Design a protein around this ligand. Structure first.
Ligand code: SAH
Lengths: 265, 265
């Protein structure tokens, strides 16, 4: 009579924690969703093979509208696991699912996994210096989202870094590239003219964190906007005021122009 | 010729990822540090037994002053692993270690693991709403640091949550409790009187994140300041204004008082 929320990590099936694997291996039923993020280095088959169980993949609709009809029923009489990319409760609405489990008289436990939220550390930017986070969403029809632009503005004024999750439309197999995010932001700048995101703005790109050779790049928008960062997923970061050691790392590791070594203070 | 920065995860020896464990087992030399944090749910012996390699523990000075004379020389002719609690490169000064490896002609790769930065998502607080983070340091002598108080102020002012790490003396294995952190903040409030941290302020306490049975509590400072949250480590969070969904999770999962559904939303 237990439900396990288990994260699978950043890139492939091996990013799951040992705790998560051992517990998953012993669950009666295993469910999972792969719409909240992209695990570019694995396949359902490899995950199933590793866990030694069949995995019933659920759609966003299955989860958001039918979690209590598809998963909870079995958790009332068995040990059930629900797998997700990265950490199960990060930048998702999955936390609320625990309230649903509770209301159904089902106990739930959470097994964390590496998340893009902490993986940003590989960019050299001090993680405590990150401010509010946001998501660059694809415009649809006449609706053109722009709130994420205001988040960068608010953080930048405080000298804080901004983590930008990029949009994803799993059913259409669409994964926003850092390039597309930069294009959208330049358009918002043209509209708002707040001097928040321009061709000279320094940005950082982290692609396929979790893999052994992720792409880590830093530089002016004008120079990176047309660069190929490899396959998704990508995240975009707009740093705030940099510490000298952050700049050094960006230059030495992310190939940023030596020019940024000269921090204004 | 290769140095692997491997995260050990949140709480015990099983919090390392399958990737991290398999890679560690293949290394000729394995180093680790426990001064930035400790794995309170396990021991060096259990970690060593799991990895099946003797682990040479390094102190803060060993790392910060002599990383290149202790770790890097061996990494030039062998596969070397450097284990740290949580996610590698989260601790402020670790990213710089990759620069030292580069300068030494040594390749380095990062193997992520769960970090408290993302694990706090288990409190039900939306990850994107966290602002700048800080550490609550013990006053001492004529030194009474209060910057962490200003961090809370600036975040809450913008409706953002504040993640507060509590002071730790690794060597002496002396943890700051959430209770202690609260008393300190109340004392800082009585000095700056900015109306930031009072007896009525809503706070969240997360203890032993990573374990299957963590302690998640929420309520006013006056009612939690004397409560027993169990064994360390403890993490303190001062939430900004709550999303109704956040509040509902805190009430249903963390036993928060029903009143936050109207008082803090
Ligand atoms: N390995 C990875 N590399 C780069 N970006 C990633 C990533 N994994 C997730 N993301 C980013 O985050 C978005 C999904 S948000 C959900 C995040 C997940 N719970 C976690 O803990 O990581 C993606 O669209 C992408 O922009």
């Amino acid at each position: 009579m237990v439900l396990y929320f288990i994260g699978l990590g950043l890139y492939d099936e091996r990013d799951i924690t040992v705790k998560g694997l051992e517990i998953a291996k012993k669950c009666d039923y295993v469910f999972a969703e792969f719409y909240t993020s992209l695990m570019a280095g694995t396949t359902l088959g490899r995950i199933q093979k590793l866990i030694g169980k069949e995995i019933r993949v659920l759609s966003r609709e299955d989860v958001e509208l039918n979690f209590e009809n598809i998963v909870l029923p079995l958790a009332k009489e068995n040990d059930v696991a629900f797998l997700t990319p990265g950490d199960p409760l990060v930048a998702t609405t999955h936390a609320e699912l625990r309230i649903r489990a509770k209301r159904a008289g089902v106990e739930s436990y959470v097994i964390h996994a590496p998340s893009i939220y902490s993986a940003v550390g590989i960019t050299g930017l001090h993680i405590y210096k990150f401010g509010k986070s946001a998501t660059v969403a694809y415009p649809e029809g006449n609706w053109f989202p722009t709130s994420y632009y205001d988040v960068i503005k608010e953080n930048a004024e405080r000298g804080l870094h901004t983590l930008l999750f990029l949009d994803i439309k799993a059913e259409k197999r669409m994964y926003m590239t850092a390039n597309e995010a930069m294009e959208l932001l330049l358009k918002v700048e043209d509209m708002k003219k707040g001097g928040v995101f321009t061709d000279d703005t320094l940005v950082v790109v982290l692609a396929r964190a979790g893999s052994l050779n992720p792409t880590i790049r830093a530089g002016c928008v004008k120079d990176l906007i047309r660069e190929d960062f490899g396959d998704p997923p990508h995240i975009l970061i707009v740093p705030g005021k940099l510490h000298i050691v952050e700049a050094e790392y960006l230059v030495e590791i992310a190939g940023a122009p030596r020019e940024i070594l000269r921090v204004n203070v």
